[PDB]
Design a binder for this molecule. Structure first.
Ligand SMILES: CC(C)C(=O)SCCNC(=O)CCNC(=O)[C@H](O)C(C)(C)COP(=O)(O)OP(=O)(O)OC[C@H]1O[C@@H](n2cnc3c(N)ncnc32)[C@H](O)[C@@H]1OP(=O)(O)O
Ligand SMILES: CC(C)C(=O)SCCNC(=O)CCNC(=O)[C@H](O)C(C)(C)COP(=O)(O)OP(=O)(O)OC[C@H]1O[C@@H](n2cnc3c(N)ncnc32)[C@H](O)[C@@H]1OP(=O)(O)O
Ligand SMILES: CC(C)C(=O)SCCNC(=O)CCNC(=O)[C@H](O)C(C)(C)COP(=O)(O)OP(=O)(O)OC[C@H]1O[C@@H](n2cnc3c(N)ncnc32)[C@H](O)[C@@H]1OP(=O)(O)O
Ligand SMILES: CC(C)C(=O)SCCNC(=O)CCNC(=O)[C@H](O)C(C)(C)COP(=O)(O)OP(=O)(O)OC[C@H]1O[C@@H](n2cnc3c(N)ncnc32)[C@H](O)[C@@H]1OP(=O)(O)O
Ligand SMILES: [Cl-]
Ligand SMILES: [Cl-]
Ligand SMILES: [Cl-]
Ligand SMILES: [Cl-]
Lengths: 234, 234, 234, 131
């Protein structure tokens, strides 16, 4: 009825500080659309195997593994920079953060070493981080060491977005809602295509547009043609 | 054929300062598409009732009422924040600004108290502000006290945007051109759908992704299905 | 397979400076889609004539000429601003930059005086700049005096982007991938339309929303209706 | 020179692509009669791709002291019912296993076979557990 004023208190303090720190990073946005039809079908095919094994199989495990595969080719996107971008540290480990909101705000735990983990393992670690995350039970280790972040806004809504890079990282993707839209196939006939938008933000002080674009294409070729991931997995 | 220097003077100075103060806000962007097929139809129907009552009715009053509805559920989006973001003021009134550009620069009049006004009353207030706005006669009271802003860029053109938040507000939305596109219906058949793009920017220091996304979904559902708006109005 | 730290050195130092400088600019984003079906056709009929004169004709010359035609009508976009944005210098020459990444990232040579050059002249000049750029042999003068930049991200991939303005310029545009989509014609029939996205960033300290937008529609109208460009060419 | 059987080492930590690379290598060497001791030794299990020449089914001979071997026949397009019940082009291959029945029982080879098969009938199934 009247205006209420309140302290930003406690845990809400971290977001203020994280997001303010991101003012120092000149964001270059790059977006695309990804045709996820073959992926949607694929997820359906593996749904029963993963249920049998006790896991719920979402799309994220696929996005994560493709991102990682992509980071092998473009390792500069899995790097950090110092106070004034004097120096860059390339990080061997793909510790990929998953953005979450809680009643206490923004939390980003990461799956460690995605580069040596299978899609099934990634699914398992996601379930774990999510359960812990919703019980307020994430460890310090779950939160530190993140090298790269994906944010599935698409689980609530949206198409395109402009996500905020988390210092000290240099890049973040936001995934929008998967939507059936009319699109042409190779014969030029109108099909049902499952279309997802992706939006990357990159620190343009050390990531040029070709890097992020080509990374995006590789990420996207992997998801549009899942079998392509098969080639180099062991 | 020749270069020319000029001072930024007078009313142009104000835009320099607002936009410069916005640099302190870490902007998070979130976008969506909205099916306005029922609303376009609904609007054609109310046109003559408005014309009879002396009012040009556009889409904005609907966008305004629906924003105020969502803000009731997500009042943090109608809030303000202080010098270095240590206190939130949650603001009772929904003073929603309509961003206009004048032969004089950026001007943001608002509709006071949208939460206690009807679409028709909002339309009346919009007509008043346009009369005065395009004549250069907006008054101090019409300009001040804004809590939240929408910007109808699509009255000129466009799809998505990155609007710039007006301090000390925490969010702003931009609406694109309503435009007919091929889209699937429930039966999986190809229809004409009146599609509009929405682009929100929010102060990620105190507004997380889920809040802007859920707000946006709510706003969207009020517009995709105007019937829902019926339920709670008095 | 461990971390490697490294100095940002040599040429990459320039990208850090430029992009850091761009933080002082409150970027406003405006985006749209452009129907290039006629243009694509048009280019197909011209390739032969230009191949016959020893010039590869891409889309870029068209985009450049149209931008140029638009800047004649909206000259504030081809302007520069000083230290805390107190004076605007309107630039007579349209020296449009073409953002390129080399094996050393960001290089932005420009075509001098687009306002007085033919599309064929612009193609020619773009060809000169490619030859040089990929040989790492662009000269000083090729790189200075830029007044406005285009960045054709879509020659790799992409739909929308949030490009970074290059001080002391006040605007840049990014062009996405040209992609066949299902679109209604005037009869209300589903057609194959050759669609491209454009994303504009502008310094909202001195360029307002209506200015970017109307400039964009003009540019867009020149491309959707290439005949329109004839009217005032000499 | 007759029968020669090199093996790809430690397949379980290699990708399809590395395996392909090793095959081309062993194929090259084999042709030039240049295979090393180390290439020929230590095999634990054998495949014979008879269908690079011909055949459907086969009875391949186990290589002591291994306990199993698979022969692969020619991939042929054959008419087969789909999920509906309509005739389709199906790309059909035969596999014949021989197993030392002193220690390998019928369910084992068969259950092994099914697993292999479904990996190949639904290649996406392999995506799932590779690293
Ligand atoms: O956990 P995440 O890995 O972040 O996704 P979930 O929270 O499981 O998403 C819940 C549902 O939204 C769905 N989901 C998740 N992300 C998306 C996107 N981006 N688009 C559309 N649907 C989505 C997901 O498939 C679940 O649906 P069903 O399994 O078919 O019931
Ligand atoms: O600000 P507004 O409330 O849009 O004022 P106006 O510019 O007068 O809007 C009214 C017209 O603009 C058009 N307009 C306004 N917003 C939009 C959107 N974003 N998309 C397409 N057209 C629009 C709308 O079609 C109205 O057309 P008419 O039915 O022919 O009157
Ligand atoms: O850089 P540009 O001056 O635009 O030209 P290039 O990148 O050399 O062009 C390479 C090809 O990609 C094409 N290309 C370039 N830009 C685009 C966009 N944005 N969309 C789709 N394809 C493109 C270009 O037309 C050339 O087409 P082809 O006729 O098939 O050769
Ligand atoms: O080529 P080579 O060096 O002769 O390699 P190989 O694997 O031995 O076989 C040669 C070809 O026969 C094909 N071949 C190999 N195995 C089979 C089976 N079992 N069925 C049918 N054709 C086969 C093989 O796919 C190669 O050709 P393309 O698919 O057309 O590219
Ligand atoms: Cl920026
Ligand atoms: Cl679309
Ligand atoms: Cl930011
Ligand atoms: Cl900004």
């Amino acid at each position: 009825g009247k205006d209420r004023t309140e302290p930003v208190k406690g845990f809400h303090k971290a977001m203020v500080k994280t997001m303010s720190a991101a003012l120092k990073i000149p964001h270059f946005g790059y977006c695309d659309e990804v045709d996820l039809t073959e992926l949607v079908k694929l997820r359906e095919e593996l749904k029963p195997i993963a249920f049998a094994r006790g896991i719920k199989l979402s799309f994220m495990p696929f996005f994560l593994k493709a991102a990682s595969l992509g980071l092998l080719q473009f390792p500069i996107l899995n790097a950090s920079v110092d106070e004034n971008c004097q120096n860059i540290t390339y990080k061997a480990s793909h510790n990929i953060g998953i953005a979450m909101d809680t009643e206490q705000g923004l939390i980003v735990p990461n799956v460690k070493n995605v580069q040596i983990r299978s899609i099934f393992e990634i699914a398992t670690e996601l379930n774990r981080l999510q359960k812990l995350g919703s019980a307020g039970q994430l460890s310090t280790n779950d939160l530190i060491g993140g090298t790269f972040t994906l944010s599935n806004i698409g689980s609530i809504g949206g198409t395109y977005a402009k996500p905020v890079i988390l210092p000290p990282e240099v890049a973040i993707g936001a995934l929008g809602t998967i939507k059936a839209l009319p699109r042409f196939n190779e014969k030029g006939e109108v099909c049902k295509a499952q279309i997802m938008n992706v939006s990357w933000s990159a620190d343009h002080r050390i990531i040029d547009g070709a890097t992020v674009s080509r990374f995006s294409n590789l990420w996207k070729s992997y998801l549009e043609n899942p079998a392509f991931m098969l080639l180099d997995l062991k």
